[PDB]
Amino acid sequence: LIKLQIQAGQANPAPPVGPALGQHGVNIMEFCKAYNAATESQRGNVIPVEITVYEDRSFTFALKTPPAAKLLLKAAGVQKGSGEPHKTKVAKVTWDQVREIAETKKADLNANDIDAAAKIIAGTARSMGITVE
Amino acid sequence: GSVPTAERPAAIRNVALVGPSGGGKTTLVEALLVAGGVLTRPGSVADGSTVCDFDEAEIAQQRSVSLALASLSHNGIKVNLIDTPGYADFVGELRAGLRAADCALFVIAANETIDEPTKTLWQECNEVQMPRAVVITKLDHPRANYDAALTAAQEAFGDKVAPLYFPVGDGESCKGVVGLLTRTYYDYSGGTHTARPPDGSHDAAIAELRGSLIEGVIEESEDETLMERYLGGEEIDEAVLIADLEKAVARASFFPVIPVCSQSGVGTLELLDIISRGFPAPPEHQLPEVFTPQGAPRKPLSCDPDGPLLAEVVKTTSDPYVGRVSLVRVFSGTIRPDATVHVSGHFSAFTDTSGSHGAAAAADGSTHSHADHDEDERIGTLSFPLGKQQRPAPTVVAGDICAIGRLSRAETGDTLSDKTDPLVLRPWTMPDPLLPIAVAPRAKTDEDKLSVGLQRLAAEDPTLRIEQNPETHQIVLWCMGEAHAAVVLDALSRRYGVSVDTVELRVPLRETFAGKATGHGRHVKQSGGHGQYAVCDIEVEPLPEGSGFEFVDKVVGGAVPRQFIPSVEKGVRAQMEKGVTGESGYPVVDIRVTLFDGKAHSVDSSDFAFQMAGALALRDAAAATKINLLEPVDDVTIVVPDDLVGTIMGDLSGRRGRVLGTDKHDADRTVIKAEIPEVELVRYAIDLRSMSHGAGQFRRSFARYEPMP
Ligand SMILES: Nc1nc2c(ncn2[C@@H]2O[C@H](COP(=O)(O)OP(=O)(O)NP(=O)(O)O)[C@@H](O)[C@H]2O)c(=O)[nH]1
């Protein structure tokens, strides 16, 4: 019953996941190979993965949609977020990318409609100090 | 009793007993020797009457601090028992004993569980693929639970650990055991070892144990149809099961458990029987790879007295009257008295890897840096170690261990062979000591013999590293820990008459200019002969790290005579070497000096005067700005359990350590990579063994120099 964020095409990093997954009773090699296959099928973005454990050390991994942070960063063209949001604006985003990410988050979120997910992404960009147009 | 003499390597066994410190190993060896007939009555470590704990240090610390060898022959099979200390500070002696052994024995007590040091000892035994057998001892203790320890052993080291002998006792003093393979209950209630069928009080449990042991062994048996046959109801023959178990143990695939009462003598006879039957022979044992002198790999020799001569000293001891007592482990060929044999001093090339600052290969002793030495010596009278007594040996066949005295230059780990066929057995793994100990001799007479004494010390103990500082001029002893450092100091202070006083280790430092500055150097002295007058106006400006010394000439009009400019340069270099910070200035590197002006006298100008003027100008320029102090940093890789990660990380946080990454060593330990300044590592080992119930293991290596924060 944990959740982490890990690079798509990379497996077995020592700081983030190794000891984190070691003390939760989860086999690491099978998870790494299955996750690598899935995220090479995806091949696009780093992903958050949620691990659910059972009493027989069985592990189930749930792969969500790419994060709103990473999706907005890759859609805006910048690499790192603004160190002073709402004071320094480093990128501009149009409504088309916003609606694409809104559809993705509708596949992810509990929002009843696409417009709600678009507003959520706009708030996420506000936390990024990135203008939404 | 009789001297145990062996004429064939098959009839010889060389097993090293290992375990925790004070695991009663010495008492077990005494009980086995009494069962062998060499000793009339069993000795006691507390009384100090034991053969193994005969050295002064062992009795002083009331624990095994140095390893010893005992020889016993049983059922026509000779056994070379190698008792080793059970403390982490003496891990190198245990590893040396492991290398000179074809099997590993773990002496543990049922009243205490397997500690982490014992687990690491099992790992070390495992990483030579050594066969391992579990011996449960101290069954007379009230809290001795054979079942609990057995289980723990079965769970920890995989399903390959299954018990071989089932004790039957009252829970206080085990009166005997039940042979699982033989269905025989051994009794010692009347003081006599009696083998009788079990009365049936454990017959169901006995049958369960036979079933489990048979299923475990028979898998390791090459006959895959044996598993079917046993699962089909067929009773596998006892002799066949025995032989399959013997083969599997010789394959280092099974770890049987045999309970032993060292105090009562219960189980010693069967234990000797198991050693003589189930244990691998040196012919059965995978003999270590033998190398040619020039590093070319050579095919390992078969363990036979008729083969090419191949032996290896594994211990060096110093005795005031007898002289050096070198224990020689022989693998191939035959050693005969008065013969001239070749002494291969480890051929350091095979041991020149790593070594940290000391770069320890073999026998250190910086005047003897690396061993790599070859010499042919004529041996004297062959002897076998029996405490301080030496039983003379007529001849030494292959596969046995012997003690040779009066050896002038023979050293521990040296490969002995025929002079016409020099050989080099693969050296043992030498743990790197990481506890530097700077000392100061009390007199120069002691100092002159200090090199000889330290060389002989490293000859006796290959695990001790000695490094003499070239910058701070400090002699520094690298030790494993508190006990090992104390032993190293005492042996140096006694066996060689070298009175030394421990001093503070000096971490080497470097100096460089922190900014541009100029200095005016004047050297005028009016003595009874020629006057001296030389003035140099140099300009010193900072350089990037590692830029070295650069000289730029800007003398206009030849005010400084051009024959004396090299003297100014030499004086500047000498002043950089001698330091620029006070009376204890560290060498100055990565600076540029630009002599642009100066003054000279027609009669009072000399090269020495210009040297002094340049040195004084450099000193003034250094005093005209700040000086950067550069301290070294050593990368440290630590293996610690995952449950203690945070404590060690915070301790390094208080030690200014920069964490590089936390790598999963295994399912329960995490490798921590970090670079720590050498100052913080002076007492890192002792605090870590604290921060880790001793579980703390780390290695260090010099990384680079950095300025002080
Ligand atoms: N109950 C019990 N105590 C024992 C036995 N053997 C030794 N001891 C006790 O344990 C202490 C020393 O044991 P031990 O560590 O095996 O001695 P050592 O062999 O010199 N050290 P090491 O085990 O590391 O080689 C002493 O207090 C001694 O009385 C035994 O069979 N039973």
TrEMBL record, chain B:
- Which Pfam families does its entry note? EFG_C (PF00679), EFG_III (PF14492), EFG_IV (PF03764), GTP_EFTU (PF00009), GTP_EFTU_D2 (PF03144)
Superkingdom assignment:
Bacteria
The Tr-type G domain covers 10-284
Q: Which GO terms describe its molecular function?
A: GTP binding; GTPase activity; translation elongation factor activity
Q: Record's SMART domains?
A: EFG_C, EFG_IV
Compositional bias of type Low complexity: which residue ranges? 354-366
Q: Which UniProt keywords apply?
A: Elongation factor, GTP-binding, Nucleotide-binding, Protein biosynthesis
PANTHER family, per the entry: ELONGATION FACTOR G-LIKE PROTEIN (PTHR43261:SF6), TRANSLATION ELONGATION FACTOR G-RELATED (PTHR43261)
Question: Which named protein is this?
Answer: Elongation factor G-like protein
